[PDB]
Write a protein that binds this ligand. Structure first.
Ligand SMILES: Nc1nc2c(ncn2[C@@H]2O[C@H](COP(=O)(O)OP(=O)(O)O)[C@@H](O)[C@H]2O)c(=O)[nH]1
Ligand SMILES: [Mg+2]
Length: 242
């Protein structure tokens, strides 16, 4: 049993059942979502949120990946949660061979590249991480990618709007994904990487259906699974590691 699914709001399960069924007609009855990111960004919390139960560890401070599989009515979602890819402000190459080792003989259907919304810049390290992922998995992982921005409930401090701040922050990271993967114009706009927002804090405003809602009113956990279901299905080739 997927026990976390009975603890979702009534309207979140209505939508999840509707998205899993839309896959079960392309004859896909399972999918593998890899979760990659720097430490601190909320990768483990987004897994706990998606699964609807506390299944991976949550911390302000390693070491092996953990696969989390749940089945609901003929459909299997496997989500791999990884160590942070960063340490001492340098790309951690060991955490990357551990993730690489756990993925040999697996088919990755979606990558969720996770970062925080609530951050004012991107640097060399952010690009060093994009490049290490490209060198590990191939430029093709970015055709199966979602940019997932946690802390979505943040309020920019400086008299500057939520949509101005977040479209700048998104633009930033997508431009860093492009440069770091050294993809050409045509290849980059034809992976057309979507940006989805996450609010994992228990402090998170609910909408009128008890769904964890973004500042615009939308149940972010349905938005995330619609988007996952879509990359899993966009008919770009999936990433088999061997
Ligand atoms: N407010 C808020 N805090 C978050 C969110 N996601 C994660 N956190 C917090 O950030 C810290 C790092 O979380 P974790 O999920 O372990 O991220 P990881 O290191 O990438 O696995 C924890 O103390 C979390 O509670 C979010 O969406 N909103
Ligand atoms: Mg973690």
């Amino acid at each position: 049993e997927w026990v976390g699914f009975q603890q979702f709001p009534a309207a979140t399960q209505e939508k999840l059942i509707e998205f899993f069924g839309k896959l079960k007609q392309k004859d896909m009855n399972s999918m593998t979502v890899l979760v990659l990111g720097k430490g601190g960004v909320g990768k483990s919390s987004t897994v706990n949120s998606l699964i609807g139960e506390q299944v991976v560890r949550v911390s302000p401070f390693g070491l092996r990946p953990v696969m989390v599989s749940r089945t609901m009515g003929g459909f299997t979602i496997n989500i791999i949660d990884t160590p942070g890819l960063v340490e001492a402000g340098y790309v951690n190459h060991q955490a990357l061979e551990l993730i690489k080792g756990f993925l040999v003989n697996r088919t990755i259907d979606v990558l969720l590249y996770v970062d925080r919304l609530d951050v004012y810049r991107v640097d060399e390290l952010d690009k060093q991480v994009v490049i290490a992922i490209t060198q590990t998995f191939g430029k093709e992982i970015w055709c199966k990618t979602l940019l997932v921005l946690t802390h979505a409930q943040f309020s920019p401090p400086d008299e500057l709007s939520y949509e101005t701040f977040s479209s700048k922050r998104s633009d930033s990271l997508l431009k860093t994904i492009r440069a770091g993967s050294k993809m050409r114009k045509q290849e980059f706009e034809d992976s057309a990487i979507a940006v989805v927002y996450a609010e994992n804090s228990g402090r998170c405003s609910k909408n009128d259906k008890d769904e964890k809602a973004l500042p615009n009113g939308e149940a972010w956990i349905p938005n995330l699974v619609k988007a996952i279901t879509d990359v899993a299905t966009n008919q770009r080739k999936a990433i088999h590691v061997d």
